[PDB]
Design a protein around this nucleic acid. Structure first.
Length: 151
RNA sequence: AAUGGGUAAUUAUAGCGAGCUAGAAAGCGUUUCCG
């Protein structure tokens, strides 16, 4: 198998700093199980199979299918979900539960069913104890809010 | 009958509990001493 580190950098930067930082990323990926990919950071070191079949093909398609077929929720909901994924106390489970149930009712009753499906999926992979589906969801939201930013 | 007195409840009830934009952007990634 093979293991990879994928950095992410703005333009007009060196290729020595860049190569060294993603070398540190591939070494943090080597340290995991040496079958692993570290997108962008020293955490986020996923196994490669879980990155393919549980981040692209599972979570990020279900995020993209939500936020492109509704108008009322936007960037702000995504940023406030990213924060609750990044903190994750025991209290933030209840706070995320209150937030998502509180935004059930605010939808147009035509999109309340689709928001309810997204509510159930996001709460289910927030309160999963195994800590796989939580950092995978955080990375899926990072990639999705990367790929929809304007100038 | 006259006289002297007031007494018992309820003290807020039902909701909303924040929403959407922005989530960093331009520059500089080496220069001099040195051959």
């Amino acid at each position: 198998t093979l293991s990879a580190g994928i950095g992410l950098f703005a333009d007009k930067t060196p290729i020595s700093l860049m190569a060294h930082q993603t070398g540190e990323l591939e070494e943090a990926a080597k340290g995991n199980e040496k079958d692993s990919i570290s997108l962008f950071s020293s955490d986020y070191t996923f196994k490669f199979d879980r990155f393919i079949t549980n981040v692209y093909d599972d979570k990020l398609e279900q995020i993209r299918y939500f936020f492109n077929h509704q108008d009322e929720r936007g960037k702000n909901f995504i940023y406030k979900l990213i924060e609750l994924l990044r903190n994750h106390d025991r209290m933030n489970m209840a706070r995320l539960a209150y937030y998502l149930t509180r935004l059930e009712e605010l939808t147009r009753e035509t999109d309340r069913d689709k928001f309810k499906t997204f509510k159930n999926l996001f709460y289910s992979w927030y309160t999963n104890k195994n800590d796989k589906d939580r950092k995978e969801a955080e990375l899926a939201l990072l990639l999705y809010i990367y790929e929809i930013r304007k100038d």
